[PDB]
Amino acid sequence: STITQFPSGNTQYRIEFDYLARTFVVVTLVNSSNPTLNRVLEVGRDYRFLNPTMIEMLVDQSGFDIVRIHRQTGTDLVVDFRNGSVLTASDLTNSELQAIHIAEEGRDQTVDLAKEYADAAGSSAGNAKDSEDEARRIAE
Amino acid sequence: STITQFPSGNTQYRIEFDYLARTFVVVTLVNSSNPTLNRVLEVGRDYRFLNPTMIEMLVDQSGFDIVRIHRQTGTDLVVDFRNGSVLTASDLTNSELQAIHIAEEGRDQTVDLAKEYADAA
Amino acid sequence: STITQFPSGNTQYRIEFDYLARTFVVVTLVNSSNPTLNRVLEVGRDYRFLNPTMIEMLVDQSGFDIVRIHRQTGTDLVVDFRNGSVLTASDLTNSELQAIHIAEEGRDQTVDLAKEYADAAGSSAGNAKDS
Amino acid sequence: AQYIPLNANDDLDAINDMLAAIGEPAVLQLDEGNADVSNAQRILHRVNRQVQAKGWNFNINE
Amino acid sequence: EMPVVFRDYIVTKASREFNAKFFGSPESELYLREQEAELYQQVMEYEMDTGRYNMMSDIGRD
Amino acid sequence: MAQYIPLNANDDLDAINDMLAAIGEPAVLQLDEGNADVSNAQRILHRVNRQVQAKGWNFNINEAAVLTPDVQDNRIRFLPSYLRVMTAGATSYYSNMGGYLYDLSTQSTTFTDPITVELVEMKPFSEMPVVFRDYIVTKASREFNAKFFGSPESELYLREQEAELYQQVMEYEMDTGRYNMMSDIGRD
Amino acid sequence: AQYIPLNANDDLDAINDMLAAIGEPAVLQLDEGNADVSNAQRILHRVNRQVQAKGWNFNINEAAVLTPDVQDNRIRFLPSYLRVMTAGATSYYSNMGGYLYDLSTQSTTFTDPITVELVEMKPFSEMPVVFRDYIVTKASREFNAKFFGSPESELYLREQEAELYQQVMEYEMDTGRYNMMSDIGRD
Amino acid sequence: AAVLTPDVQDNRIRFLPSYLRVMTAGATSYYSNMGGYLYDLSTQSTTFTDPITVELVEMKPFS
Amino acid sequence: IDSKVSMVIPIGSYNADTYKTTVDIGAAYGGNAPSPGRYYLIDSQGAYVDLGDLTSISTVITLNGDWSGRTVFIGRPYLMSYKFSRFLIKIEDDSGTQSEDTGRLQLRRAWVNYKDTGALRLIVRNGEREFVNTFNGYTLGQQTIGTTNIGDGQYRFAMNGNALTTSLTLESNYPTPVSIVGCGWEASYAKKARSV
Amino acid sequence: PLITQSIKNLKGGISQQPDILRFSDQGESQVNCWSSESDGLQKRPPTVF
Amino acid sequence: PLITQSIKNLKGGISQQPDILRFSDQGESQVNCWSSESDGLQKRPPTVF
């Protein structure tokens, strides 16, 4: 869910996930034929925000086919605990949310590379298994 | 771990791993010969809960041999925090356990399944 | 990163990643020609912790050409919360750091293990079919 | 997080809802109990028999 | 094995008697009455769609 | 948050917290089964949801649905998620007897070919439209207050709130379908 | 001697006004507080969401393009949507497993962009003034009723609420003209 | 009769907190605030290029 | 805790291989094994560990970490209990006690006032069911990081059932003080015949 | 409607008379407790070796 | 409506009992005060060198 792709050509696009800061959103142009020509865009000169869930493009989309938007959370801590201070709910909430988010991107990333090897190995294993053992048992 | 396989032709089954909510359990019937015949059951119509550890099957196992149970943790908050309430240890424990479980599953499951298939082959 | 490779035949080696306990780091030898040949060592009779960032061996062979060091974080609550105790910043920090470490750990070793198991199953299929 | 019930049975649920009117908690079984559980069943059976006898489109067999 | 609305209507009717004959509360009442009325009209509405009941049938000529 | 929708919200916990507010006490913070109030509230919420969903609206009624019989012994099961079974434009005689589909006109329980009927199925609470959720929550709060803790001022306001919400539900219902009457008429 | 406030925010003032009904003084921040501050925000948010969903002249957007992704043809159902309808016909749309469901075709396999009519949600501090006042009064009534049943703080909020409701009405009637004698002409 | 003009760098018009009502004299209007800027629901944009004329009501001191 | 005794861990600090330190608690109790039971180990800040069931055949324990050159406290815990009586309508004017014994009574809620309390539990048993409620010191938004929670306030919970079958109990076996002041209840009443 | 009642202080001990005749501040059992004069119920002090 | 109450005289001293049990004449702290019998609270007289 953290990775989304749309066809190129329009001027307005939507964001379909939650985020903690506006620096955790990345926009990239994609060329399917030659993946060595991708380019990254920067806020303030290529695109601008309108409302918390929708952006607008300001550049030329030529020679590209897909626009990709995904989330990338940072690793540094947000809340610092110190002895001799009052405990509040907001700190706990932010601390929990950061870890939950990071785990989300980790799983979503790893499953993609996992599945194809997994099911290829499984299918080959099963096909070999039955095609050999029943054939040999009928032969004997 | 987070995945288990059992022989077919039974009436009851047991859950060994841990979960935080009762909607995080997935049941699936397995055909050894052809993976494409796999089908996913659904709660209420096919199975029901007797105790927090055992389920009951209400469908017939006709052309299948393996029953597979695995866990998939959700992404919604289990514990929220608001000023003026009462704080105890179990809240913090669950708040940590959710984020631990997600990563553990996402790291282990596929490798465990590949190991199972290879050593069965 | 999380996985490190060093040549053998050296007296001193260093670790370049953080950890939460001394039982998480894993030390093993490696033989390139024989993938099966690697052997995993263990604490005490083979290596000792002089400095938190220093590792010193005790015995070294020659058939093994290189070494491997990587991290292995457990899935048990390091911190324990009980009624009638005190709360410290270190507990809250470590409880958060655990899952974070697990994330980039898996993000590294998963893909490498998957291919090895897959082509091992493929070789099993192959020799099962031909003989 | 849908509410998945444990060991659901219609009769036990009906008795439990009938008990909630006074303001007493639920029960787990019907084999043994106090007087109230033995007083609700008679009323439930009588009301069921009375209501079913009015005659509806899915009852009358010509 | 009866339809749902009938079961709810029966349960409400039974609860009214159970409250009336064993524990007289003035606030648990005054609510079951309106709930019963609503369930009654719902039952009638449900019953009316099972049959079509066209009065213009068996009539035809030039 | 303070400016916009809070992140990763849980609907059932919010509904329970709203239900407990009528009594006059703060949140519960975990939704555990150990506490007495949660178990009492959940049953009432489930019953109210099931009752309200069964009236029949324009987004529930599936006119054309196909049921298929079994192979070994010709029968059709009666799942507990069914709420109403009828026929499109004619009288129908369908009922449950022994856990299978019964036909009163024929007096048998042996269907041989797939049939088409009209039915309404159940959906989880979290996937209903907003106004329905608010209406259900207010209604359920009314019983919870009435049966377990009698307060004289929480009442006399929930009634007005319920009427106001009912009117809005009706207006929302009348907008999905245009319901033109002058159609299907044409001549010189 | 005009009154210039110090460090004004369009949310803290609403919270303070909602506390004024009981008869407690104001606060200076929303980070540390007792239960009341944690009890007012829930009601305020619920009332705002309920009121905004009725449908007005500045919410309704007749033209809007929803587009599918590229991998698995589907359309997501964000939690900020409030109403989904077709402009001049009948519609069968609903949410099933966080996706858009069409009852007519009984599938979730849209392949081309669709044009629909929907209403989205806006933050509290970007609405016209009368709406904000009406929402605050509505929230204050419930807050007083549920926790501290004073008999004199009431009997007045109703009188204010009726007047505010009226004003909202004639505010709505002026943005649009709605001339019935349109698209009519011949000799 | 009132005149509003956009700035130079970009093409936007600000929404001051002293505005109470914004409408068009003799027709239907679609104006609102989104992120402290003037929004036109008819065209679905916040990019005006020429000065426009509307009617509005502002605030005055109590005295 | 019971049978308290102070102690200072000697210079000898663990062993490099496993960095686990030994204590040998026998020295503290005059070079003698203590009586069998359960024992705790509270440090100078408040965090405590739970040792096993010490017998008379062993006096050596192992701790997790360095420790060394620190002050500790050892002892045993005991239990506190208190059971309420039945709740009835009582009228009393220093001349005599009159208890109403007519009608039916259903309970709704209850509350307890406390002062300088660390932890407590309340148990309700109606017919065959048990409900456990717990509270801990102050509430969220007033605590300070670094110390233990000891404060004041009020607690309200739910009591449902008939007034001739319900019972209430208090328990505590934590190393924190306890103090209770007052209590009360609410109910609904219904008769069928005027008195007098 | 609803009725209510409160108990001012808990200073009496246990009692074994039938429940109809007891006072308002006498309980049923009491183990390891101290009935102070101005602080209510407490826990008994510890013991030193 | 509105309710009210009044205190006739302040002659009691401080008290350390729980607030539910105190009288209406007893406060919480009292430093450098003189509780006369006909003039209420006052300030203590000075000292000469």
Side-chain angles (χ1 to χ4, degrees):
Chain A
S1 72
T2 60
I3 297 169
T4 49
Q5 316 164 242
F6 299 122
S8 167
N10 304 347
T11 69
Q12 294 204 342
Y13 293 111
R14 300 190 180 245
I15 288 153
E16 303 175 359
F17 48 69
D18 311 85
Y19 63 91
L20 281 184
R22 286 190 181 182
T23 64
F24 293 164
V25 178
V26 189
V27 176
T28 312
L29 300 187
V30 177
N31 183 4
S32 60
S33 304
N34 191 359
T36 71
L37 304 183
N38 307 288
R39 304 191 320 87
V40 176
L41 308 184
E42 293 82 3
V43 63
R45 187 159 61 55
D46 294 358
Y47 58 101
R48 300 181 316 185
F49 273 60
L50 183 74
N51 61 5
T53 66
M54 184 177 177
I55 81 172
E56 323 167 16
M57 301 275 318
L58 269 53
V59 296
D60 189 358
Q61 305 153 21
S62 63
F64 293 113
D65 292 331
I66 297 89
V67 169
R68 193 211 290 240
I69 303 180
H70 65 121
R71 179 176 61 186
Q72 173 154 50
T73 315
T75 63
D76 301 338
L77 302 193
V78 177
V79 177
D80 293 338
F81 296 113
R82 293 180 297 80
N83 287 357
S85 57
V86 178
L87 193 70
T88 62
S90 66
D91 292 331
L92 300 185
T93 303
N94 302 2
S95 63
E96 176 184 2
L97 287 186
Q98 183 175 0
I100 299 191
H101 281 230
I102 278 181
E104 271 195 350
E105 292 84 4
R107 181 177 64 181
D108 188 314
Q109 184 34 270
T110 185
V111 64
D112 189 359
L113 276 297
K115 304 153 281 213
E116 51 275 0
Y117 290 128
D119 44 3
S123 53
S124 55
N127 189 358
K129 181 266 292 179
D130 45 9
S131 303
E132 301 145 355
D133 62 358
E134 279 93 10
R136 206 47 188 69
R137 261 73 165 177
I138 301 303
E140 65 93 19
Chain B
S1 66
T2 57
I3 192 166
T4 304
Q5 288 191 358
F6 288 125
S8 279
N10 315 70
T11 66
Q12 303 184 9
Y13 291 113
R14 314 201 51 270
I15 301 145
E16 51 285 0
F17 57 86
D18 291 331
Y19 52 75
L20 291 187
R22 199 179 298 115
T23 66
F24 290 165
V25 179
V26 187
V27 194
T28 295
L29 290 174
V30 176
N31 168 240
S32 58
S33 298
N34 189 359
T36 73
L37 320 183
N38 283 318
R39 64 211 302 290
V40 179
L41 274 48
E42 190 276 331
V43 68
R45 304 171 51 280
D46 302 356
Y47 59 101
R48 59 182 301 243
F49 277 105
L50 281 73
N51 64 27
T53 54
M54 311 185 38
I55 75 189
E56 182 65 26
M57 292 264 298
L58 302 173
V59 186
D60 62 358
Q61 303 102 290
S62 51
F64 299 114
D65 52 358
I66 301 299
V67 178
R68 176 184 306 178
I69 313 178
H70 60 294
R71 186 181 59 184
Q72 184 178 2
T73 304
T75 62
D76 204 0
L77 286 175
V78 185
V79 178
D80 191 298
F81 294 110
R82 304 202 102 72
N83 291 0
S85 299
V86 178
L87 191 50
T88 58
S90 62
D91 306 333
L92 283 73
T93 306
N94 295 124
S95 71
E96 294 294 328
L97 281 185
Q98 183 176 3
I100 289 190
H101 281 308
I102 296 182
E104 191 215 9
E105 281 164 5
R107 181 184 66 174
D108 278 14
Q109 293 179 356
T110 303
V111 182
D112 296 318
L113 189 151
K115 274 202 71 53
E116 281 276 19
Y117 283 0
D119 291 331
Chain C
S1 69
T2 300
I3 190 167
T4 53
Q5 188 274 330
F6 283 60
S8 180
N10 191 304
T11 69
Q12 291 308 121
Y13 314 84
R14 295 180 65 86
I15 62 170
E16 311 315 346
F17 50 81
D18 293 331
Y19 54 110
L20 283 191
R22 305 187 309 128
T23 63
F24 286 168
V25 185
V26 173
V27 182
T28 183
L29 294 198
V30 171
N31 180 7
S32 304
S33 61
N34 188 3
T36 80
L37 199 49
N38 26 240
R39 288 184 50 121
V40 179
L41 282 71
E42 61 86 20
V43 298
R45 292 183 291 113
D46 313 291
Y47 53 79
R48 294 181 311 91
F49 285 0
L50 188 153
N51 214 14
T53 74
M54 281 325 317
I55 181 64
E56 293 82 3
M57 48 172 168
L58 294 175
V59 68
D60 176 56
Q61 313 334 110
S62 298
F64 294 64
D65 50 359
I66 48 154
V67 304
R68 194 161 301 310
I69 304 295
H70 72 77
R71 191 170 63 180
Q72 193 64 340
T73 311
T75 69
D76 264 344
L77 271 183
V78 175
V79 191
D80 194 338
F81 295 110
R82 311 171 56 69
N83 276 299
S85 293
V86 287
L87 271 63
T88 61
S90 182
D91 291 331
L92 313 179
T93 310
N94 290 318
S95 65
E96 191 155 280
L97 273 295
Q98 185 165 359
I100 310 174
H101 285 300
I102 302 183
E104 41 275 27
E105 183 178 1
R107 194 222 311 290
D108 291 331
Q109 292 82 18
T110 57
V111 292
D112 313 288
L113 278 293
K115 264 182 41 53
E116 191 46 287
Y117 278 113
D119 63 358
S123 170
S124 172
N127 66 316
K129 180 67 174 66
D130 70 1
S131 179
Chain D
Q2 303 74 70
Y3 171 62
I4 321 290
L6 291 173
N7 204 3
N9 187 5
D10 291 331
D11 291 331
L12 188 153
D13 291 331
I15 304 295
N16 276 357
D17 307 293
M18 200 189 311
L19 271 190
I22 294 173
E24 283 212 6
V27 297
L28 300 183
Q29 63 84 30
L30 293 189
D31 301 77
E32 69 275 16
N34 50 4
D36 308 321
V37 184
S38 300
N39 291 357
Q41 310 213 258
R42 188 198 304 286
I43 301 182
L44 188 67
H45 182 246
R46 177 149 52 72
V47 172
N48 185 5
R49 214 191 50 220
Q50 182 216 300
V51 170
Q52 261 177 61
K54 293 182 183 293
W56 305 98
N57 193 61
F58 64 98
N59 286 320
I60 289 145
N61 184 4
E62 311 276 40
Chain E
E1 66 183 1
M2 286 214 89
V4 181
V5 290
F6 286 71
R7 295 205 304 244
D8 277 21
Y9 181 51
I10 296 182
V11 170
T12 297
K13 264 172 81 63
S15 306
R16 280 198 60 182
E17 293 179 353
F18 191 54
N19 176 244
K21 276 149 92 153
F22 285 109
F23 177 66
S25 168
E27 293 179 353
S28 186
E29 182 65 26
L30 202 163
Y31 187 60
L32 293 184
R33 294 178 66 188
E34 70 166 320
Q35 199 166 110
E36 187 183 0
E38 164 192 359
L39 286 172
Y40 186 59
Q41 65 182 357
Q42 211 184 310
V43 166
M44 221 75 68
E45 196 176 348
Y46 166 69
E47 191 285 346
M48 271 165 188
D49 313 278
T50 300
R52 298 315 181 183
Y53 296 163
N54 195 7
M55 63 193 47
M56 293 265 300
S57 309
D58 189 358
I59 288 168
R61 74 280 191 190
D62 193 5
Chain F
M1 69 290 291
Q3 290 208 4
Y4 183 76
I5 297 89
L7 284 74
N8 296 119
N10 190 3
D11 303 308
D12 291 331
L13 183 59
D14 291 331
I16 301 299
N17 276 351
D18 291 331
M19 224 185 288
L20 265 70
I23 298 314
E25 293 180 353
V28 60
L29 193 71
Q30 182 147 41
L31 196 145
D32 189 358
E33 299 189 0
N35 197 357
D37 300 320
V38 171
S39 64
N40 295 358
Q42 284 181 354
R43 276 147 62 68
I44 300 192
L45 187 65
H46 194 60
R47 203 167 54 68
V48 174
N49 186 5
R50 180 148 54 70
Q51 183 215 300
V52 174
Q53 281 198 60
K55 289 204 209 220
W57 308 96
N58 198 60
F59 66 88
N60 266 305
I61 302 182
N62 181 2
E63 190 277 331
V66 177
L67 297 192
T68 174
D70 164 18
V71 176
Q72 287 69 240
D73 67 301
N74 297 318
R75 275 168 178 181
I76 299 183
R77 284 153 61 63
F78 205 73
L79 307 183
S81 71
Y82 295 165
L83 294 192
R84 270 165 42 123
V85 183
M86 291 164 177
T87 305
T91 55
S92 60
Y93 314 115
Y94 288 128
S95 176
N96 179 12
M97 185 180 288
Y100 299 85
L101 204 72
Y102 194 40
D103 186 74
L104 188 52
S105 77
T106 312
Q107 295 180 120
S108 66
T109 312
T110 60
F111 303 112
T112 183
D113 291 331
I115 75 185
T116 61
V117 297
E118 177 182 359
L119 74 164
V120 164
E121 292 177 61
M122 182 152 169
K123 298 162 47 61
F125 168 66
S126 57
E127 304 177 297
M128 311 275 308
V130 183
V131 292
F132 284 71
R133 293 206 300 244
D134 280 24
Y135 183 51
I136 294 184
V137 170
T138 299
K139 284 181 58 63
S141 305
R142 284 196 61 183
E143 293 83 4
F144 185 58
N145 181 66
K147 284 162 111 163
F148 277 120
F149 181 71
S151 173
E153 275 139 5
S154 305
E155 202 86 10
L156 183 63
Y157 177 70
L158 296 193
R159 316 181 61 210
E160 154 189 290
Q161 191 75 359
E162 183 187 303
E164 170 184 0
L165 284 188
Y166 181 38
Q167 156 174 311
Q168 203 182 300
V169 176
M170 206 54 79
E171 301 146 90
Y172 170 94
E173 181 65 26
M174 283 166 178
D175 291 331
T176 61
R178 302 322 217 193
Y179 292 150
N180 188 5
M181 61 175 98
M182 310 146 267
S183 69
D184 189 359
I185 302 179
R187 44 212 160 102
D188 199 357
Chain G
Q2 188 37 239
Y3 164 64
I4 296 89
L6 292 173
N7 194 58
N9 267 349
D10 291 331
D11 185 351
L12 188 153
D13 44 18
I15 300 298
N16 278 355
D17 291 331
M18 200 192 309
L19 289 175
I22 278 178
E24 291 216 350
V27 297
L28 302 183
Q29 64 167 36
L30 290 188
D31 303 78
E32 293 83 3
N34 48 4
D36 313 308
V37 179
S38 301
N39 288 356
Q41 277 164 304
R42 187 197 305 286
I43 305 185
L44 186 70
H45 182 246
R46 180 148 57 72
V47 174
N48 184 7
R49 213 184 61 230
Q50 164 204 343
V51 173
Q52 271 199 58
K54 194 162 311 203
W56 309 99
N57 193 61
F58 66 101
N59 291 115
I60 293 165
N61 188 4
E62 306 284 356
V65 184
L66 297 191
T67 187
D69 63 358
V70 189
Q71 303 293 350
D72 61 327
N73 297 318
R74 267 201 297 238
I75 299 178
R76 262 169 279 260
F77 203 109
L78 311 185
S80 74
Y81 296 165
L82 291 190
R83 289 174 62 188
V84 175
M85 287 150 192
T86 287
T90 52
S91 59
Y92 313 105
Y93 290 129
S94 181
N95 169 45
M96 185 180 288
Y99 283 117
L100 201 71
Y101 188 56
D102 185 74
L103 191 49
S104 290
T105 187
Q106 295 171 139
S107 73
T108 62
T109 316
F110 307 116
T111 175
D112 285 5
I114 309 169
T115 61
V116 298
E117 189 276 331
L118 76 163
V119 167
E120 297 181 60
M121 183 177 177
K122 300 150 50 63
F124 179 65
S125 68
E126 323 193 5
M127 311 215 67
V129 179
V130 285
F131 284 68
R132 294 203 303 244
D133 267 1
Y134 180 52
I135 292 178
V136 172
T137 296
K138 261 174 82 53
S140 304
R141 280 197 57 185
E142 178 166 354
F143 188 58
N144 180 69
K146 258 174 184 170
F147 286 108
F148 177 67
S150 167
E152 315 203 7
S153 192
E154 297 259 357
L155 189 148
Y156 189 54
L157 292 185
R158 310 163 50 180
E159 172 187 340
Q160 283 191 358
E161 190 184 20
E163 164 191 358
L164 295 193
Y165 186 56
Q166 169 202 298
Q167 203 174 330
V168 173
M169 221 75 68
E170 69 274 15
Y171 174 72
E172 183 178 1
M173 291 215 198
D174 291 331
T175 80
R177 295 318 180 185
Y178 305 133
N179 191 9
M180 43 185 48
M181 284 195 61
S182 306
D183 199 337
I184 298 174
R186 73 279 191 190
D187 170 55
Chain H
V3 179
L4 297 190
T5 187
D7 63 358
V8 179
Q9 293 82 17
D10 63 358
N11 295 357
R12 307 199 202 122
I13 305 184
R14 313 161 50 101
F15 205 71
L16 307 180
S18 61
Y19 293 167
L20 295 187
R21 287 182 33 181
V22 180
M23 307 157 171
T24 284
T28 54
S29 62
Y30 315 114
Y31 290 130
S32 175
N33 182 11
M34 201 155 38
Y37 285 113
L38 204 70
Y39 189 53
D40 186 74
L41 194 49
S42 83
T43 187
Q44 275 172 160
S45 86
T46 73
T47 179
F48 306 108
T49 186
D50 315 318
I52 58 178
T53 61
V54 297
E55 66 182 1
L56 74 164
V57 172
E58 311 183 28
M59 206 172 188
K60 301 162 48 64
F62 167 66
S63 57
Chain I
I1 54 186
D2 202 356
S3 299
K4 317 200 313 177
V5 55
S6 171
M7 185 207 208
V8 172
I9 304 179
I11 300 302
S13 68
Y14 61 87
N15 44 1
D17 63 358
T18 68
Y19 84 112
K20 303 290 95 174
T21 177
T22 183
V23 167
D24 180 59
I25 72 170
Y29 277 117
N32 294 124
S35 63
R38 301 179 52 71
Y39 289 81
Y40 281 178
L41 185 87
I42 297 90
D43 65 354
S44 60
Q45 281 92 299
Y48 68 89
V49 191
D50 186 5
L51 317 177
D53 273 9
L54 294 174
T55 73
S56 53
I57 72 181
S58 297
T59 63
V60 172
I61 66 177
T62 54
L63 276 296
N64 264 327
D66 177 9
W67 298 102
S68 184
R70 299 162 70 129
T71 308
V72 292
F73 299 113
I74 317 180
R76 305 178 312 179
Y78 50 101
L79 179 71
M80 161 178 198
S81 176
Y82 183 63
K83 187 171 133 82
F84 283 103
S85 56
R86 272 173 193 180
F87 287 123
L88 297 177
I89 315 188
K90 263 169 200 142
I91 193 66
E92 194 277 335
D93 308 303
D94 175 60
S95 169
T97 291
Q98 287 69 240
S99 176
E100 183 65 27
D101 165 24
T102 313
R104 190 158 187 175
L105 194 83
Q106 308 275 303
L107 307 179
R108 309 299 195 184
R109 307 303 300 267
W111 70 81
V112 171
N113 292 320
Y114 65 99
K115 184 213 301 303
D116 291 331
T117 303
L120 202 69
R121 305 192 320 180
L122 292 92
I123 308 177
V124 180
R125 277 176 275 241
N126 189 3
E128 208 58 2
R129 305 177 60 70
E130 302 216 10
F131 301 119
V132 183
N133 319 301
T134 313
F135 80 90
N136 182 1
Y138 266 126
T139 57
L140 199 60
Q142 304 202 5
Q143 318 179 0
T144 68
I145 314 175
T147 63
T148 312
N149 287 175
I150 294 182
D152 305 333
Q154 191 186 4
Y155 190 57
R156 305 184 55 117
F157 54 94
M159 261 184 68
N160 288 303
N162 189 359
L164 282 72
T165 315
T166 316
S167 63
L168 183 70
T169 315
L170 276 71
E171 310 204 344
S172 161
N173 51 355
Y174 305 115
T176 56
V178 165
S179 297
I180 310 290
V181 179
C183 61
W185 53 263
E186 296 163 25
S188 170
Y189 195 44
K191 299 172 64 36
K192 293 214 281 272
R194 193 161 70 81
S195 73
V196 175
Chain J
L2 297 194
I3 64 182
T4 185
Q5 205 161 58
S6 63
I7 311 176
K8 276 313 177 51
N9 204 2
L10 299 176
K11 79 200 179 180
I14 80 174
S15 174
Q16 289 184 356
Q17 269 181 353
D19 288 272
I20 309 98
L21 294 170
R22 298 183 183 177
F23 278 63
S24 55
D25 57 357
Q26 306 189 1
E28 174 90 357
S29 69
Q30 178 168 354
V31 186
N32 293 2
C33 295
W34 176 249
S35 310
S36 79
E37 293 179 353
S38 67
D39 300 11
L41 272 75
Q42 294 177 354
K43 193 186 304 186
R44 75 176 181 72
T47 300
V48 185
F49 181 68
Chain K
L2 296 194
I3 64 182
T4 183
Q5 211 166 59
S6 64
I7 310 176
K8 290 301 186 63
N9 209 3
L10 296 173
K11 77 201 180 180
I14 80 172
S15 174
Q16 291 181 356
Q17 261 184 355
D19 307 74
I20 307 98
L21 301 182
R22 301 186 185 180
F23 281 63
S24 54
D25 291 331
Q26 308 184 0
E28 169 97 355
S29 83
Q30 177 170 352
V31 186
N32 292 1
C33 292
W34 176 244
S35 311
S36 82
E37 48 269 61
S38 67
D39 303 328
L41 274 74
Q42 290 179 352
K43 189 187 293 191
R44 79 171 177 71
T47 61
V48 193
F49 180 69

